[PDB]
């Protein structure tokens, strides 16, 4: 369509592969590294860069947390009882519980990692989901919501297109994918709660670009 799912898939593949002491600090390290790659990923998504400039700022600044969580959760299908960070570190479930944050960590595994594996979610679907999360018309203060909403609908159309041809003996796959997005939103809001706390007690190396995303502009 005017929202090509292979060219979205390209954006997914063209920002990933890397093989190769606190739990939380390591995640925050990885988060910062991946925020840079994220911007390069966003331009690679059709019609994104063509939007206004303060609109691109608002989209990425609103959904960066969900997007990164989405993209590390899909990487972590390989691993079990854990998460694979972009810095090539494995953060194990049990190590998460002792660092304080087992509850939110386990929700990521059950509602995102496990579900993604069990439905053998491919990279094209991930990109389309993330593309939807990126094109959030609900984002506060954005110039032209209708432009955003419009772009989102093109992704929806195309993700449905892709699901019917690639998996015709699952008519309700398209819906089942779309239902990860709420669970993703709820986790993302909980992870921002946790991060705002970790910033404000001081104890955690929060690097520059992650810091910028957390301070009201």
């Amino acid at each position: 369509e005017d929202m090509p799912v292979e060219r979205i898939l390209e954006a997914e593949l063209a920002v990933e592969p890397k093989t190769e002491n606190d739990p939380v600090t390591n995640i925050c390290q990885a988060a910062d590294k991946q925020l840079f790659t994220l911007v390069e990923w966003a331009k690679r998504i059709p019609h994104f860069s063509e939007l206004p400039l303060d609109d691109q700022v608002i989209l990425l600044r609103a959904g960066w947390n969900e997007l990164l969580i989405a993209s590390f959760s899909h990487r972590s299908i390989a691993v079990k009882d854990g998460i694979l960070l972009a810095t090539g570190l494995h953060v194990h479930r049990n190590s998460a519980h002792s660092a304080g944050v087992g509850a939110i960590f386990d929700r990521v595994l059950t509602e995102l990692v496990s579900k993604m594996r069990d439905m053998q979610m491919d990279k094209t679907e991930l990109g389309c989901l993330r593309a939807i999360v990126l094109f959030n018309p609900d984002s506060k203060g954005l110039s032209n919501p209708a432009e955003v909403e419009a772009l989102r609908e093109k992704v929806y159309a195309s993700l449905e297109a892709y699901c019917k041809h690639k998996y015709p003996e699952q008519p309700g796959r398209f819906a089942k994918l779309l239902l990860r997005l709420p669970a993703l939103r709820s986790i993302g809001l909980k992870c921002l709660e946790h991060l705002f706390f970790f910033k404000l007690i001081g104890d955690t190396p929060i690097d520059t670009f992650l810091m910028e995303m957390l301070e009201a502009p």
Partner: peptide, 9 residues
Amino acid sequence: HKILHRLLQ
């Protein structure tokens, strides 16, 4: 503002 604005070019 600083970092994000920049990378968008």
